[PDB]
Write a protein that binds this ligand. Structure first.
Ligand SMILES: C=CC[C@@H]1/C=C(\C)C[C@H](C)C[C@H](OC)[C@H]2O[C@@](O)(C(=O)C(=O)N3CCCC[C@H]3C(=O)O[C@H](/C(C)=C/[C@@H]3CC[C@@H](O)[C@H](OC)C3)[C@H](C)[C@@H](O)C/C1=N\NC(C)=O)[C@H](C)C[C@@H]2OC
Length: 107
């Protein structure tokens, strides 16, 4: 893998740890910027438990590098995303994926 491209900084103090819940807005795109999904388009950020295998590994390893308020691109190689199988109807095999994420809240 995960490469963190910095866009807008967070508070530099509050970073998620394994087992934390996080609230994150994301836009997911292919390498050329073609969007495959977006929580912003749904008017509501995504929530999950981080670092425990509940989301793709690029999130588990990348989101813990962000501080609250930060906007960044999490660029995931396929072994940190959907791997050899891809995601049916959405993601091809072996796809590098971009998630432009904004960390809104930690619990
Ligand atoms: C397959 C589970 C379906 C089931 C579906 C829902 C509750 C509906 C929900 C609104 C859909 C997701 O919207 C948040 C969509 O999210 C994306 O659009 C996205 O942007 C996207 O990549 N993500 C969304 C935001 C965080 C990072 C990432 C992610 O990790 O997504 C989870 C997922 C598909 C995990 C695979 C699981 C299989 C396993 O083999 C793989 O290993 C590599 C991993 C996703 C949160 C999953 O856990 C949720 C689910 N059940 N969970 C349980 C039961 O615990 C992807 C591309 C496609 C997803 O639609 C299917």
């Amino acid at each position: 893998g995960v490469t963190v491209e910095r866009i807008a900084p967070g508070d530099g103090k509050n970073f998620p740890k394994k087992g934390d819940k996080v609230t994150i807005h994301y836009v997911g795109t292919l390498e050329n910027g073609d969007k495959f999904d977006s929580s912003r388009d749904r008017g509501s950020p995504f929530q999950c438990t981080i670092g425990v295998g509940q989301v793709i590994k690029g999130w588990d390893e990348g989101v813990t590098q962000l501080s609250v308020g930060e906007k960044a691109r999490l660029i995931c190689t396929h072994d940190y995303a959907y791997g050899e199988r891809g995601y049916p109807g959405l993601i091809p095999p072996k796809a590098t994926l971009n998630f432009e994420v904004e960390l809104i809240k930690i619990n």
